[PDB]
Amino acid sequence: PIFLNVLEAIEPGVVCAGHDNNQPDSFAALHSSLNELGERQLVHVVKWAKALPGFRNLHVDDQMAVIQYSWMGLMVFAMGWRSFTNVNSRMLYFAPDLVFNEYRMHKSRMYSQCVRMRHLSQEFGWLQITPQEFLCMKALLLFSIIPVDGLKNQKFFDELRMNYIKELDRIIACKRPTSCSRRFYQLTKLLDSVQPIARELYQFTFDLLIKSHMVSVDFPEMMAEIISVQVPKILSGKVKPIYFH
Ligand SMILES: C[C@]12CCC(=O)C[C@@H]1CC[C@@H]1[C@@H]2CC[C@]2(C)[C@@H](O)CC[C@@H]12
């Protein structure tokens, strides 16, 4: 099972946010820690992506592009899995030192987005997603958002994305024909549901970056760069998700 061997081998370990839990749960402290966690997780997402089967087949400029458009969906999907496995999904397990309860959901002023993230987390339980399904679904999320004008070499991207869809298909077929088809429908519907959630968070973090000097929220360098250079291409419609349905 070469493909799943690789996905297990490269899956990132635990990342802490560095949050001071003795602080009061203020809007500023909570988002400053979420932003630091994003910066820390971005390092791991880059190293993970570059180690995926076939990823180096992409043009080098397309490699950075797909990471810089897919990161929010990748990290929210992984956080949903962490939450499902660690607290059976009624708190958001952003990190071992940054677990959101309903109070922090409210204080962060992103309660409705947290509710949608919690619903995504719960789907791992409702659908009884296996670790292998999770790993292959998360890899596919890296290949699920691109510029409407295409990448520098779109042909190799389309081929790579095709191959990851095939791997998802194999994972479903190894498990068990009408059940295979039902499962693939369920998993592709689940994958589609990540992008609307990521879009809402992209809108929220963009607005927060613009007003960050007035609400006392710190943005690390890579986050500030990606959210001002790449995220607005998503929000203005220059970069769009690839949906199954
Ligand atoms: C990706 C992160 C951080 C990593 C994670 O586990 C998911 C979580 C989802 C919300 C993001 C957060 C990074 C910082 C953001 C973008 C804040 O600015 C607003 C929403 C936060």
CATH number for the domain spanning 186: value is: 1.10.565.10
CA distance 203 to 62: 23
Phi, psi of 19 (to 5 degrees): -75, 135
SS3 at position 88? coil
What is the experimental method? X-ray
CA of 164 to the centre of ligand 1 (A): 26
Residue 99, H or E segment: strand 98-100
**Does ligand 1 lie within 6 Å of residue 31's CB atom?**
yes
SS3 at position 95? strand
Is 90 annotated for ligand binding?
no
Tokens of 207: 């607005």
> Residue type for 113, please?
Q
- Contacts (Cβ under 8 Å, ≥6 apart) of 154: 146
Residue 136, H or E segment: helix 131-141
Sign of the Cα torsion 167, 168, 170, 171 reads positive
The range of the structural domain enclosing residue 161 comes to 2-241
List Cα–Cα distances, 8 to 49, 135, 160, in angstroms.
13, 7, 19
Q: Count of CB atoms within 10 A of residue 192's CB?
A: 15
Please count the structural domains in the chain: 1
CA distance 50 to 149: 23
**Does ligand 1 lie within 6 Å of residue 73's CB atom?**
no
Phi, psi of 147 (to 5 degrees): -65, 145
SS3 at position 147? strand
CA geometry: angle 207, 209, 215, nearest 5 deg:
90
Nearest to 56 by CA among 140, 64, 139: 64
**Does ligand 1 lie within 6 Å of residue 17's CB atom?**
no
For residue 95, give the ligand 1 atom closest to its CA: 6
**Pairing of the two strands 92-95 and 239-241:** unpaired
- Contacts (Cβ under 8 Å, ≥6 apart) of 52: 6, 7, 10, 139, 142
For residue 201, give the ligand 1 atom closest to its CA: 20
Nearest to 218 by CA among 38, 13, 97, 67: 38
